[PDB]
Structure 1
Amino acid sequence: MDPREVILCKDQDGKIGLRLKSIDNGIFVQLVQANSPASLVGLRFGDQVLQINGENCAGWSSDKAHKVLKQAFGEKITMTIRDRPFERTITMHKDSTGHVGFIFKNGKITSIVKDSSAARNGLLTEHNICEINGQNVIGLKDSQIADILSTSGTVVTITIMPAF
């Protein structure tokens, strides 16, 4: 899957609304602030940052990545992104009680309920939910995600990735 190029423009505090995290000697988006330079260019939780301003991110720590952003010179920051490489999609169907079949806490799937659609479809635990029927749920309270599910209809398509 080919990477893509984005050019961000800093806000007033020299920030772009982005938190990053080192995973397996790569750099990944950990949080994207709403209505930020990062959201303007379509960054999402789980996107991989391959390069910043012409430097490869391979092997950088979280602290280094944050420092490079904070210190970035001028008002424009260039990045090359591999769109969330660990993403998978699972489609489930609600049962007669309105459930798809998993336990959820602090943004993580923690258990799979027996005899459910989640079980039939091989949903995994220690995974975060990124989207529900296309809607970002990263950073939402568990109760807000419950709200969303209540109005999603019988078909529930989620994007997930390992929590790492």
Structure 2
Amino acid sequence: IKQGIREVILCKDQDGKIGLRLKSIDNGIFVQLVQANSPASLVGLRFGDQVLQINGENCAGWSSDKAHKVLKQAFGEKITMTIRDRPFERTITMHKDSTGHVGFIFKNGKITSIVKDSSAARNGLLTEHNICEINGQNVIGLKDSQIADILSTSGTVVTITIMPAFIFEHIIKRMAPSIMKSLMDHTIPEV
């Protein structure tokens, strides 16, 4: 998680899209959805990113509808954006035991127990937190089984990005479970 504020420059694609859904939380605007292969994905916008500004206008206090309106009505040629990196999220690093476990249970991507003397316990992993990313890959909307499978196919070192459950439930309100599984960018970062 980068500790402050960066500028990003988007271009609407050929259908006039940037591949973003924004959401109002606590008088800020946050990324609720990034579409795969979107101008939003190419410049590296992530679920939980805070949009401080669009084209130099402060987003403070905007409704989600006004944020989408401002975007729709923008000279697609070139949109600038000031971004704070997933301010609600934290990153935890764990190591698999010889049995290949980091040491937690989860249901709907929300961690509900920490196993005793697990890596999860040693690095202070918490319950009532949703898994957003594993090793930089967004897993939101994937089946539990499929998240389980990604933790298998990661190495012995597993970095998880997490978010308090209440904050996660507030961000994803009014988006069908089909959109998150099917249209949320789940790609491995690109170099």
Q: TM-score, normalised by structure 2?
A: 0.73
Deviations 1:12-65 (A, max 9, x none): 332210111222211111221111110111101111100012210111122221
Structure 1: any 5+ residue segments left out of the alignment? none
Task: Identify which range, 44-53 or 56-65, moves more after superposition.
Answer: 56-65
Q: 1:148 to 1:50 in 2, by over 3 A?
A: same
Give the distance between the partners of 2:79 and 2:141, measured in 1 at CA.
24
Q: 1:74 to 1:150 in 2, by over 3 A?
A: closer
Q: 1:157 to 1:16 in 2, by over 3 A?
A: same
Give the distance between the partners of 1:68 and 1:109, measured in 2 at CA.
36
- Structure 1 residue 11: Cα displacement: 2.0
Give the distance between the partners of 2:66 and 2:116, measured in 1 at CA.
44
Task: Identify which range, 112-121 or 43-52, moves more after superposition.
Answer: 112-121
Deviations 1:49-104 (A, max 9, x none): 00012210111122221222223244322211112223322122223432222222
- Structure 1 residue 159: Cα displacement: 1.9
Identity of aligned residues (%): 100
> Secondary structure of 1:148's partner?
helix
Give the distance between the partners of 1:60 and 1:126, measured in 2 at CA.
28
Give the distance between the partners of 1:69 and 1:145, measured in 2 at CA.
33
Task: Identify which range, 130-139 or 116-125, moves more after superposition.
Answer: 130-139
- Superposed CA RMSD: 2.0
Structure 2: any 5+ residue segments left out of the alignment? 1-5, 164-191
Give the distance between the partners of 1:6 and 1:115, measured in 2 at CA.
42
Deviations 1:113-132 (A, max 9, x none): 33422123221223232332
The structure that is strand-richer by fraction is 1
The structure that is helix-richer by fraction is 2
Task: Identify which range, 94-103 or 30-39, moves more after superposition.
Answer: 94-103
CA contact (8 A) 2:16 2:76 kept: no
Q: Aligned residue for 1:117?
A: 119
Q: TM-score, normalised by structure 1?
A: 0.83
Give the distance between the partners of 1:14 and 1:6, measured in 2 at CA.
18
Q: 1:117 to 1:23 in 2, by over 3 A?
A: same
Q: Aligned residue for 1:6?
A: 8
Q: Aligned residue for 2:69?
A: 67
Give the total of aligned pairs: 158
CA contact (8 A) 2:10 2:79 kept: yes
